[PDB]
Amino acid sequence: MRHRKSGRQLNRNSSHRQAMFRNMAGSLVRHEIIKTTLPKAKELRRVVEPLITLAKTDSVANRRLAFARTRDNEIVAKLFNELGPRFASRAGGYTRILKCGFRAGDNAPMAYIELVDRSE
């Protein structure tokens, strides 16, 4: 009855649920903005935010930890070098959620998740 319960299943078993966020987070970091379904977007907010908070500091331990999850040398180098200093001042809240339209083919409510900055 999920009283005071967190998380979302997203109609998947745990392992697949976890592994797709490992992929979705790195997909975000490399592109800084992605289009996805709204409930998936809200659950992504509890994943990338820890990483940007992990990149607000810097060490060898954090470099291994942010490599422990997310399993990518490219992303971890994209992290800890640009995204960290770019978000050095913000106290949390590094993502924006913009609700786009409706995915015609499953009628899913899609949305845009991007970084706050995205300065070009």
Partner: protein, 56 residues
Amino acid sequence: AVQQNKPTRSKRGMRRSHDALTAVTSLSVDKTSGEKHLRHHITADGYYRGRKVIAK
């Protein structure tokens, strides 16, 4: 587990009472571009609250 006598077309219609869709009636015109976007939804071009939000 089946019917006993076929339901009348009248009784058929009464079952279709609560099936009409509800109209939107919430099309907020954008402040700058002026598109007919839904509330809390970006426009067709990617404007929201008077800002090129999508950068696309």
